[PDB]
Design a protein around this ligand. Structure first.
Ligand SMILES: *S(=O)(=O)Oc1ccc2nc(-c3ccc(Cl)cc3)cc(C(=O)O)c2c1
Ligand SMILES: *S(=O)(=O)Oc1ccc2nc(-c3ccc(Cl)cc3)cc(C(=O)O)c2c1
Lengths: 239, 239
């Protein structure tokens, strides 16, 4: 439990990444970094995690990513890779095991097109934070439904359980972390008129990788409570 | 000249793409679609162009891309690919000739990270359109310089003429179309304190692919004049 505690302002910069492992600079409740962690787990990649206190960042972390954002991968050769979708594609290419992206140029482009379709959803988390009452909440639900109908159309067209076929693949993991938090946001009704999307969510929760990393509603709310209180302890909720 | 004229509202949907060619739905002055055209030319890919009148779109074009945006690739097998960066990566993978993206997972990720670094520049075209006087213009220049300093740092770190090395590669073509329009926007002073970036621009203009597709300042201004007048003839400036 204690080894997961975040590194913040004044922490010593970590040592080199050992041969045979890759490191991810992450935060336990960041959906972008969850993408990378899903991919690490799905591909069976040996790794270490350093959590970053994003409310109280170490100065040395800007040497890992000049933008100060997680996720960041660092390997034994000293190479640094950031931007969540880039870290995921890098891992899929650089490591053996289950290929998460198809080899076919067209089918890979399709996955990336679905990812572009999804692009408005992460910024609706900001809309969620700024929603203060029942009227804001009604409008927010409508904003989520609008985006979710687009994803429903993809699953209708394909007639598969997942966004890349009948097997879980990269695209599913790239979109999953925002769906993971719907119940905690009280936005689970927004999939009510998207039945294929609703079944997709149930199938995702049964995926061994997703299940291994899933954070409970209570933990989501614990984190959120502290994060909106602007606590430097938010990132270490539950330790 | 006349074959380049755009298809608009009421035009007949085009026939199938012939075997041996790929089609791009484009517009002659769209920088996103210029990315794809640069890649088609650089890789020596046989193709046909259908220009879309973006101020007066054919209803059938939404069957090619539900979002109604260029570029869109359509091949002889009926597959449709859109989103400019996706069309480019697709072409690099699907076709023979010069590989524009490196094979190495890390160096490919680096190109994509530079692309993410560039992400604010296309939206500064909107800032440009909304700039109405000399005070707005001063602020606009400062906004461009801020982004350009980030790219200057990439070239300083690498000590190469281009963003992916000493040879032109995918990343250069992905960012080029916005730099092509700097002189016409009267923003060429914004590279004055970024000397490596300024030399990059001069080297790009000498690239045979870039040179083959480059549009003159006068044509840029012709298009812009008509586009801001909201003309349905803007897209066909010069015919
Ligand atoms: S910060 O840590 O720099 O960035 C950040 C990380 C994670 C965030 N998660 C949420 C969130 C968490 C739980 C629930 Cl139920 C809803 C939303 C929100 C935000 C945010 O934008 O405030 C996060 C920011
Ligand atoms: S529209 O055609 O749907 O989209 C579109 C295409 C191209 C644009 N080009 C410019 C532009 C052209 C020349 C110069 Cl000097 C500066 C800017 C602007 C815009 C825009 O956002 O208005 C374009 C829109």
């Amino acid at each position: 439990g204690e080894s997961a505690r975040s590194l913040g302002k004044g922490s010593a910069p970590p040592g080199p990444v050992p041969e045979g492992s890759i490191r991810i600079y992450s935060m336990r409740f960041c959906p972008f970094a969850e993408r990378t962690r899903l991919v690490l787990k799905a591909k069976g990649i040996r790794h270490e995690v350093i959590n970053i206190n994003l409310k109280n960042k170490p100065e040395w972390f800007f040497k890992k990513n000049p933008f100060g954002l997680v996720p960041v991968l660092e390997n034994s050769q000293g190479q640094l890779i950031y931007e969540s979708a880039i870290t995921c594609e890098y891992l899929d290419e650089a490591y053996p095991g289950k290929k998460l992206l198809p080899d076919d140029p067209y089918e890979k482009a399709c996955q990336k097109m679905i990812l572009e379709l999804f692009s408005k959803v992460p910024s609706l988390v900001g809309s969620f934070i700024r929603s203060q009452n029942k009227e804001d909440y009604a409008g927010l639900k409508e904003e989520f439904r609008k985006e979710f109908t687009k994803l429903e159309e993809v699953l209708t067209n394909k007639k598969t359980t997942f966004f890349g076929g009948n097997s879980i693949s990269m695209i599913d993991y790239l979109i999953w972390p925002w769906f993971e938090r719907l119940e905690a946001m009280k936005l689970n009704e927004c999939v009510d008129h998207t039945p294929k999307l609703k079944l997709w969510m149930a199938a995702m929760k049964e995926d061994p990788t997703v299940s291994a990393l899933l954070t409970s509603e209570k933990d989501w709310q614990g984190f959120l409570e502290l994060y909106l209180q602007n606590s430097p302890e938010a990132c270490d909720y539950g330790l």
